[PDB]
Design a protein around this ligand. Structure first.
Ligand SMILES: [Mg+2]
Ligand SMILES: [Mg+2]
Ligand SMILES: [Mg+2]
Ligand SMILES: [Mg+2]
Ligand SMILES: [Mg+2]
Ligand SMILES: [Mg+2]
Ligand SMILES: [Mg+2]
Ligand SMILES: [Mg+2]
Ligand SMILES: [Mg+2]
Ligand SMILES: [Mg+2]
Ligand SMILES: [Mg+2]
Ligand SMILES: [Mg+2]
Ligand SMILES: [Mg+2]
Ligand SMILES: [Mg+2]
Ligand SMILES: [Mg+2]
Ligand SMILES: [Mg+2]
Ligand SMILES: [Mg+2]
Ligand SMILES: [Mg+2]
Ligand SMILES: [Mg+2]
Ligand SMILES: [Mg+2]
Ligand SMILES: [Mg+2]
Ligand SMILES: [Mg+2]
Ligand SMILES: [Mg+2]
Ligand SMILES: [Mg+2]
Ligand SMILES: [Mg+2]
Ligand SMILES: [Mg+2]
Ligand SMILES: [Mg+2]
Ligand SMILES: [Mg+2]
Ligand SMILES: [Mg+2]
Ligand SMILES: [Mg+2]
Ligand SMILES: [Mg+2]
Ligand SMILES: [Mg+2]
Ligand SMILES: [Mg+2]
Ligand SMILES: [Mg+2]
Ligand SMILES: [Mg+2]
Ligand SMILES: [Mg+2]
Ligand SMILES: [Mg+2]
Ligand SMILES: [Mg+2]
Ligand SMILES: [Mg+2]
Ligand SMILES: [Mg+2]
Ligand SMILES: [Mg+2]
Ligand SMILES: [Mg+2]
Ligand SMILES: [Mg+2]
Ligand SMILES: [Mg+2]
Ligand SMILES: [Mg+2]
Ligand SMILES: [Mg+2]
Ligand SMILES: [Mg+2]
Ligand SMILES: [Mg+2]
Ligand SMILES: [Mg+2]
Ligand SMILES: [Mg+2]
Ligand SMILES: [Mg+2]
Ligand SMILES: [Mg+2]
Ligand SMILES: [Mg+2]
Ligand SMILES: [Mg+2]
Ligand SMILES: [Mg+2]
Ligand SMILES: [Mg+2]
Ligand SMILES: [Mg+2]
Ligand SMILES: [Mg+2]
Ligand SMILES: [Mg+2]
Ligand SMILES: [Mg+2]
Ligand SMILES: [Mg+2]
Lengths: 159, 58, 172, 48, 185
RNA sequence: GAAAUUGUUGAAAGGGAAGGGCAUUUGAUCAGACA
RNA sequence: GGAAUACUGCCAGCUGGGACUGAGGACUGCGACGUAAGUCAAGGAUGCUGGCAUAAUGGUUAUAUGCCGCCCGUCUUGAAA
RNA sequence: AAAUAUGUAAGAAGUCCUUGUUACUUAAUUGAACGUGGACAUUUGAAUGAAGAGCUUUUAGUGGGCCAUUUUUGGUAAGCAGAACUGGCGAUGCGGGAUGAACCGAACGUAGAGUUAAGGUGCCGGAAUACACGCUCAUCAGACACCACAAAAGGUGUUAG
RNA sequence: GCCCUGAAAAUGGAUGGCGCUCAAGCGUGUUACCUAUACUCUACCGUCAGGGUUGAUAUGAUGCCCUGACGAGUAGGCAGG
RNA sequence: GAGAACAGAAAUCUCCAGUAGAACAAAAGGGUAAAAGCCCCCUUGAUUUUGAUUUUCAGUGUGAAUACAAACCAUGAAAGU
RNA sequence: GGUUGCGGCCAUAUCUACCAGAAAGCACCGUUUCCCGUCCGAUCAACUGUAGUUAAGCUGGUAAGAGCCUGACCGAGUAGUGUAGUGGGUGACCAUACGCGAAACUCAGGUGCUGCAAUCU
């Protein structure tokens, strides 16, 4: 009959990355987590203890508890037509600080600058982000660059 | 007497009538399952700072 | 696919810091309007260069008009096409009064003789054959003998009304 | 703000017609959809 | 056709009148819809709607809850408004003066209030004294105190009171209710 | 003293069913409105 | 050398033929034309003329003619079956 | 090692300054957690949309499904059996495909005028026995998606290469 | 490429039928034209929404007035009759 | 692989190479090299209390598992486990 | 710059073959009373720093070296793919339209960077 155990279908998922087996480097252990931090989740197959279920692989959540060897991460999983709160107990080997926040955090500081920076001069800022605009006009020269004319080419076999 | 065994057909139609409700989010979430040693202390800490505002309204 | 105009289309890869002034390539393109023509351009460039339209720009688009629209001309035409079971090169000769007219009858011919729709053809080259006697296909040579003349036997008048009172005559 | 203010324009069928035997191919394939660039004006006028 | 994106022909879902068939109630509503249309006072809009409310959504306010409110900072001289009935409460011993306007005062509430030289006022006497509801303190009673809501949301681990008739041990207190009898909730 | 169903009388249609829909001709019949 | 024309586009340029509609019911608005008085096609048709005043138009009904129309009820994935 | 799918983020529940509370924690008034006081407003932090958003109770029918494109298992195969995503039919008429549950087009209050879709315009039948270049002659020609089948292999028929 | 051979089944019979051969056939191009319960404009019904209106001395305040958008439907729910 | 009496294809001895080509009860897949394998030393945490959490899910139960709190212990020079 | 003790990233650091290394350091190196471990003071323990050596370790350089790393309109806008059609084809399959876009290949450039503390012609 069918089979649906805890680590089922996870053959390649928890595998270890080519020529990256063995001890986990100590920086993993030196990193620090605080309640409220955002972390991305990804299982280290060599660390069987305190391991996320496969569902949570590649999922990103917020730290809510800090314990001796682990952090508690809340993840919102959607079941049926709705989300339920889930709290995971992950060991530090299966978690890393998310960068999903840097382009913001680095942009916030930046915003504060050119906000005060400008203001002091005499305003006129504009610091919302804007999408790729279309291209403006432009003139392209021919100097040293007369257009090369190509045609399509006949069918041929080489084999 | 065999029959259809299983299908997801029409299930996301259904999930989407009333919607996939985005998670709902609160300031001050629960401390459910947070380290009991921490909480015990956090409890007296709060007792303390509260005292020192009742005190600052003397 | 329609009544053709002929376009020069000029394009290039977008500029970059380390490469401003990219090279600039032109094609003559036979299409019925400039939208089809710029599309055909990108089609063919992507068979020659590392480009697509998402990383290139059309620099210029310009319709080319026949130089002597009322001079009869013998065209050499080179085509690549796809059949049901293989792809193939062909040389046809067309006699008309403009490259544009020439290309319209080609596509017609390719459709009628070989069942090639527009998607399946590549004009490789269309060129005016200067001196006769480099004219090579007989169905054309026929028409350049000296003092050429011919009747059109069996004349067929169009009726304008459903009943006639005569009995026609195909004389001419 | 300006453009949200305008209700969606409610057009008729083109009065000339569509210029094509079949609408649901791209403009480029002798059909009717996609970016047809400046040829949009002739359409819209015939529909307005 | 129209790719609709919301139900067509959808009623707003708010009472619009009361469901009550009472002349006097319907007259108070005549009063306050006029007041609501012709003054920009928010008070009148609120009161309008409250008259529509059904009995559940009008829990009784007690005279002690009234007293509590008047203990608010800067509030003792406010005239409190209850759009519903006001009940009496022997649990407070010292009740203040004020003026209460409500739909109904019980015998003993009226007494308690009046004996402290307060004043019981109908909503329309209220209207004439305070057309923009100036200086008013609207109190609502506890809706989710009702015995019914004890059982809303019944389910494992929700902690929420069986619909049960007889109660005692031997009534729904075994298997599923304790660790030693199958499981707990 | 209903209906199914039947006799007579009157009117009408009917080239392997009949009945029905939108529409008008034809025939029969009828309301209203005018001053 | 100097024009014309085609093609595509624009005009708050002028103008003819034909069809359907005329909701609303004092005034009230935004305007236009006039030196003005005043006028108007400007927040929904009025002017002028004729015919009948009756089965004429209209309803109903039978018939005919154009095109269309399978037997309802039911269980069923699916019924005229 | 793609493409399509998929997690989180784009601020007032935000950022920075000062320095209170504890029994936790540090060699340590160290940290950690929660705070008092202070500073900065709608270009306050991408787009598009929003006939508003949130919430609570109670109850019906249902719990045989079937089909199409694409992915796809078993099977020689099936108008066969079984899954994936979407869209349909079932529950739905209307125009087209002669006919037909599911295809194309398009979803329905009672109507007038106009313009179209898909599909057509010899006659049946509303609509060019229109225009244009070719090709095709069959003593069992051919004739429009789903679709109502034809293959290997041959021809000194004819066509263009 | 078109055409021909390859190509055998049972009532008489189906490019829908007639019929069609420089097609009314096959490939391809260009115009015009026909017509859906769809699109546009308008009237009328009803549903939903947003406004306005207790002021006597006349008649519906569940009323009256203005405005916008919407309308398929088995099982089934509710509503006004 | 290259070496040493009896000793042979295979007994026991030594050196070299050796990313795991082995081993870890068992199916297979993951994992692991001063180890998770092999040899030795000390042991009973396979214990005590009662909650939270993940999978299956109705977010019931059961099974299994995760990270803490409160005991009492084991091992280690120790951090630890 | 060298070297050492503790490191971070964990091959540009590995592998094969050669050659070069001053000064300090490290090392190899001597001993067996003591603690301590062995079949064996080889490992492990202690003791000397005295008696000896750059031979090895170590560090570095060489190599149309093996490996690895980086780049490139090198291949390739190729394979594959999201979307469309009353597109072609008996079919198997295939072309076109609006997009996304590899891997191998090939050629070029590289061959540890760096933190803390002590030390050194
Ligand atoms: Mg299985
Ligand atoms: Mg374990
Ligand atoms: Mg059965
Ligand atoms: Mg079955
Ligand atoms: Mg079933
Ligand atoms: Mg020319
Ligand atoms: Mg026109
Ligand atoms: Mg027309
Ligand atoms: Mg015209
Ligand atoms: Mg067509
Ligand atoms: Mg129009
Ligand atoms: Mg109680
Ligand atoms: Mg009780
Ligand atoms: Mg009798
Ligand atoms: Mg009769
Ligand atoms: Mg009739
Ligand atoms: Mg009128
Ligand atoms: Mg009127
Ligand atoms: Mg008379
Ligand atoms: Mg009369
Ligand atoms: Mg008369
Ligand atoms: Mg009749
Ligand atoms: Mg019929
Ligand atoms: Mg039955
Ligand atoms: Mg059956
Ligand atoms: Mg039958
Ligand atoms: Mg997304
Ligand atoms: Mg908006
Ligand atoms: Mg709104
Ligand atoms: Mg229910
Ligand atoms: Mg139910
Ligand atoms: Mg049920
Ligand atoms: Mg479909
Ligand atoms: Mg059914
Ligand atoms: Mg339908
Ligand atoms: Mg039909
Ligand atoms: Mg058919
Ligand atoms: Mg016929
Ligand atoms: Mg006709
Ligand atoms: Mg014509
Ligand atoms: Mg086909
Ligand atoms: Mg042939
Ligand atoms: Mg046939
Ligand atoms: Mg026909
Ligand atoms: Mg044709
Ligand atoms: Mg209609
Ligand atoms: Mg309309
Ligand atoms: Mg309905
Ligand atoms: Mg194993
Ligand atoms: Mg180790
Ligand atoms: Mg046990
Ligand atoms: Mg149970
Ligand atoms: Mg469980
Ligand atoms: Mg030395
Ligand atoms: Mg020694
Ligand atoms: Mg030693
Ligand atoms: Mg040496
Ligand atoms: Mg090399
Ligand atoms: Mg694809
Ligand atoms: Mg297809
Ligand atoms: Mg291909």
């Amino acid at each position: 009959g069918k089979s649906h155990g805890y680590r089922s279908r996870t053959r390649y998922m928890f595998q270890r990355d080519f020529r990256k087996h063995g001890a986990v480097h100590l920086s993993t252990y030196l990193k620090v987590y605080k309640v409220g931090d955002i972390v991305d989740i990804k299982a280290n197959g060599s660390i069987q203890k305190g391991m996320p279920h496969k569902f949570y692989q590649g999922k990103t959540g917020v730290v809510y508890n800090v314990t001796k060897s682990s952090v508690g991460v809340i993840i919102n999983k959607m079941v049926g037509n709705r989300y339920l709160e889930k709290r995971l107990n992950l060991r530090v080997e299966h978690i890393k600080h998310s960068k999903c926040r840097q382009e913001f955090l680095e942009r916030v500081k930046a915003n504060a600058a050119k906000r005060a920076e400008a203001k002091a001069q005499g305003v006129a800022v504009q610091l919302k982000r804007q999408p790729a605009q279309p291209r403006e006009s432009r003139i392209v020269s021919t100097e040293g660059n007369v257009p090369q004319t190509l045609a399509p080419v006949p069918y041929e076999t080489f084999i | 007497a065999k029959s259809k065994n299983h299908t997801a057909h029409n299930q996301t139609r259904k999930a989407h009538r009333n919607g996939i409700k985005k998670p709902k989010t609160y300031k001050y979430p629960s401390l459910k399952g947070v380290d009991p040693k921490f909480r015990r202390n956090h409890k007296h800490a709060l007792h303390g700072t509260a005292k020192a505002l009742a005190a600052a309204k003397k | 696919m329609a009544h053709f105009k002929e376009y020069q289309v000029i394009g290039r890869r977008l500029p970059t810091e380390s490469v401003p002034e990219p090279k600039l390539f032109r094609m003559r393109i036979f299409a019925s309007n400039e939208v089809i023509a710029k599309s055909r351009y990108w089609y063919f460039l992507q068979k020659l260069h590392k480009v697509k339209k998402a990383s290139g720009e059309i620099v210029s688009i310009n319709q080319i008009n026949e130089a002597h629209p009322t001079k009869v001309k013998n065209f050499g035409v080179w085509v690549r096409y796809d059949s049901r079971s293989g792809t193939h090169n062909m040389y046809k000769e067309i006699r008309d009064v403009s490259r544009v007219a020439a290309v319209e009858t080609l596509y017609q011919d390719m459709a009628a003789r070989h069942r090639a729709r527009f998607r399946s053809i590549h004009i490789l080259k269309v060129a005016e054959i200067e001196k006769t006697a480099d004219v090579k296909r007989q169905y054309v040579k026929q028409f350049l003998t000296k003092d050429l003349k011919f009747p059109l036997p069996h004349r067929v008048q169009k009726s304008t009304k459903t009943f006639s009172y005569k009995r026609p005559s195909t004389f001419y | 703000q300006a453009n949200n203010f305008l209700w969606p324009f409610k057009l008729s069928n083109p009065s000339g017609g569509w210029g094509v035997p079949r609408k649901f191919k791209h403009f480029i394939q002798g059909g009717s959809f996609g970016n047809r660039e400046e040829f949009i004006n002739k359409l819209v006028k015939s529909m307005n | 056709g129209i790719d609709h994106t919301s139900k067509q022909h959808k009623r707003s879902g708010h009472r619009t009148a009361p469901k009550s068939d009472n002349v006097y109630l319907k007259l108070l509503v005549k009063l306050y819809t006029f007041l609501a249309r012709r003054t920009d006072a928010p008070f009148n809009k609120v009161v309008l709607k409250a008259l529509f409310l059904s009995k559940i959504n009008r829990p009784p306010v007690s005279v002690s809850r009234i007293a509590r409110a008047l203990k608010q900072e800067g509030a003792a001289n406010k005239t409190v408004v209850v759009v519903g009935t006001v009940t009496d409460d022997a649990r407070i011993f010292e009740f203040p003066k004020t003026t209460v306007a409500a739909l109904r005062f019980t015998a003993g509430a009226r007494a308690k209030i009046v004996k402290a030289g307060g004043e019981c006022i109908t909503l329309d006497q209220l209207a004439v004294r305070a057309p923009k509801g100036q200086n008013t303190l609207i109190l609502r009673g506890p809706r989710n105190s009702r015995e019914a809501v004890r059982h809303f949301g019944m389910g494992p681990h929700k902690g929420k009171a069986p619909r049960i008739l007889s109660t005692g041990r031997k009534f729904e207190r075994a298997r599923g209710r304790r660790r030693s009898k199958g499981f707990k909730v």
